Structure 1
Amino acid sequence: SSLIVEDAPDHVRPYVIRHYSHARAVTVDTQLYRFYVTGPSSGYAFTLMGTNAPHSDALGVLPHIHQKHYENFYCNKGSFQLWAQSGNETQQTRVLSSGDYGSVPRNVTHTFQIQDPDTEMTGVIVPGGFEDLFYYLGTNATDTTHTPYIPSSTLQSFDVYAELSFTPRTDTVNGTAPANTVWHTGANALASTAGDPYFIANGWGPKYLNSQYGYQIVAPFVTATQAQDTNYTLSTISMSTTPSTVTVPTWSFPGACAFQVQEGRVVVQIGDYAATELGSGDVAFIPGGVEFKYYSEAYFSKVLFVSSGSDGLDQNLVNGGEEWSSVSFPADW
């Protein structure tokens, strides 16, 4: 019943789960999957999973579609290539490195390939419960030492539909194809409407500065425009420390939310649990209707944030802030 758990709970409650906790681990070939937030733990709001894997010369999965789930690919570290296509639109591919993001709405064909030896892919899937597929195809892993990974169609019920006619394009240059795309060389926009895949390289997407509680920079990844009926938001939030004269705000939202620290040290105080400090890869989950406070102990922290509903923490900070063109906040309060 303590706040920190080794596997996500089997019912909705506040919790924190450390990076590389057991988290119902399974392996699929050389890949190791951890389920930090599950359907049961989030009341089916979303799934937050981590995949660690070594370099592979082959695709990590055969090309496929999910008709009822929206997947979000975030590169925690290392690098992996992601391919995506909607309808008959041109097929897109990007090589994601640390902090890069790839959006895969429902009905978008996709696959990936792990490039670097110490690669970690954080997946946020909406709605929650998609992890059953990985329990099913996976082999349970005890992983006593908590090592990141181990050194070395008919799945319609799980919402997986094969796309055997898809051929991942092979004309990648400087991490992107086709050639007329912007990747780490300029600004990236979110898709103009729902249904289309899109990618945002670390620090190149739109940002908003909120100065109500110290400085926080929200970099939206998914908004109402893209989520539509899937009804969620996703972004990174970067944070300064909170000045001594500023009260750390208490929040209570209609929907569940969660974050995974990427950089820095973030303290979270949820419900009646102790204020707890989270470091890299650690995850905090807050049920809808539960009060919480968070602040950065580090001088700069950045977290990956997901929320069920259209008016979660990220959107609130955006609406209370202003457009902003830097990954850094002002030097003066």
Structure 2
Amino acid sequence: IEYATRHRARSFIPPEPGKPYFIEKGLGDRAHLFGDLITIYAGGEQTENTFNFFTCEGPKGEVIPAHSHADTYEVFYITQGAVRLFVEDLEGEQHEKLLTPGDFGFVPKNCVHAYRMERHHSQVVGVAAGPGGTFERFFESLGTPAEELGLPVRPFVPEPEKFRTVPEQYDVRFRPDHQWHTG
């Protein structure tokens, strides 16, 4: 039922590829990054580095700021609350949409994107992968792994040195000068 893996002393994901498994609600590998809880149910180890499966949940007003991925495609499927997704296409045209549970957003590689959770404890199902493989361990590497359940009581704010080195390692480029005009 419980396993030890390269990522956690205690996990419900098995260390060996090829093994079927089940995980109850909430019990994937957990990470905190600012106010968000990220929960990983499958990683690249489970899929020969083809895809992953994770949830992100957070408090009202939590922002994932503008960033892009050079070799990763990313799915946003809302399961709780309401999440406003901002996207810029390759040509520079911007759009925003308030996604409610069961709605879907797709962000192709090199498209700048950001989102804001607009309800308390909103939750997004994410899959993010591409030719480059998968990068779900980005969140615990920039932020921190967590054993506790539920939202971080205090936001985990990464040290500037982490921002300097970690994001490029996981195909994340933040775009701090980006401006949204989607109104």
The interval holding the TM-score normalised by the smaller chain is 0.7 to 0.9
Q: How does 1:155-304 map to 2 (within 5 A)?
A: 155-171=167-183
Structure 2 CA distance for aligned equivalents of residues 47 and 112 of structure 1: 20
Matching residue of 2:25: 19
**Number of aligned residues:** 163
Residues 52-73 of structure 1 show CA distances to partners (whole Å, capped at 9, x for unaligned) of: 11101x5x22211101110000
Structure 2 CA distance for aligned equivalents of residues 63 and 89 of structure 1: 14
- Unaligned stretches of 5+ in structure 1? 172-333
Structure 2 CA distance for aligned equivalents of residues 135 and 129 of structure 1: 14
Q: Does the 8 Å CA contact 2:55/2:123 hold for their aligned counterparts?
A: yes
Identical aligned residues as a percent? 24
Report the TM-score, using the length of structure 2 for normalisation. Answer: 0.80
Q: Does the 8 Å CA contact 2:95/2:182 hold for their aligned counterparts?
A: no
Structure 2 CA distance for aligned equivalents of residues 38 and 47 of structure 1: 5
Matching residue of 1:98: 101
Q: How does 1:42-121 map to 2 (within 5 A)?
A: 42-56=47-61, 60-121=63-124
- Unaligned stretches of 5+ in structure 2? 3-9, 155-162
Q: Does the 8 Å CA contact 1:85/1:110 hold for their aligned counterparts?
A: yes
Structure 1 CA distance for aligned equivalents of residues 26 and 58 of structure 2: 13
Residues 272-298 of structure 1 show CA distances to partners (whole Å, capped at 9, x for unaligned) of: xxxxxxxxxxxxxxxxxxxxxxxxxxx
4+ aligned runs moved over 6 Å, structure 1: none
Residues 238-263 of structure 1 show CA distances to partners (whole Å, capped at 9, x for unaligned) of: xxxxxxxxxxxxxxxxxxxxxxxxxx
Structure 1 CA distance for aligned equivalents of residues 54 and 123 of structure 2: 10
Q: Verify: 1:150 aligned to 2:152, yes or no.
A: yes
Q: Does the 8 Å CA contact 1:64/1:161 hold for their aligned counterparts?
A: yes
Q: Verify: 1:129 aligned to 2:141, yes or no.
A: no
Structure 2 CA distance for aligned equivalents of residues 18 and 37 of structure 1: 13
Structure 2 CA distance for aligned equivalents of residues 38 and 87 of structure 1: 28
| Shift of residue 164, structure 1, vs aligned partner | 2.9
Residues 219-240 of structure 1 show CA distances to partners (whole Å, capped at 9, x for unaligned) of: xxxxxxxxxxxxxxxxxxxxxx
Structure 1 CA distance for aligned equivalents of residues 108 and 15 of structure 2: 27
- When residues 87 and 165 of structure 1 are mapped into structure 2, their CA distance, relative to the original with a 3 A threshold, is farther
Structure 1 CA distance for aligned equivalents of residues 69 and 12 of structure 2: 26
Q: Does the 8 Å CA contact 1:72/1:125 hold for their aligned counterparts?
A: yes
Alpha-carbon RMSD: 2.1
Matching residue of 1:231: none
- When residues 137 and 79 of structure 1 are mapped into structure 2, their CA distance, relative to the original with a 3 A threshold, is same
| Shift of residue 6, structure 1, vs aligned partner | 4.7
Q: Does the 8 Å CA contact 1:8/1:35 hold for their aligned counterparts?
A: no
Q: Does the 8 Å CA contact 1:93/1:169 hold for their aligned counterparts?
A: no
Q: Does the 8 Å CA contact 2:94/2:182 hold for their aligned counterparts?
A: no
- Structure number with greater CO (CA < 8 Å, separation at least 6) is 2
Structure 2 CA distance for aligned equivalents of residues 135 and 61 of structure 1: 15
Structure 2 CA distance for aligned equivalents of residues 44 and 169 of structure 1: 36
Matching residue of 1:29: 34
Residues 162-219 of structure 1 show CA distances to partners (whole Å, capped at 9, x for unaligned) of: 3233212351xxxxxxxxxxxxxxxxxxxxxxxxxxxxxxxxxxxxxxxxxxxxxxxx
| Shift of residue 151, structure 1, vs aligned partner | 4.5
Residues 90-146 of structure 1 show CA distances to partners (whole Å, capped at 9, x for unaligned) of: 201101111010001111100111110121111011245311211211222111xx3
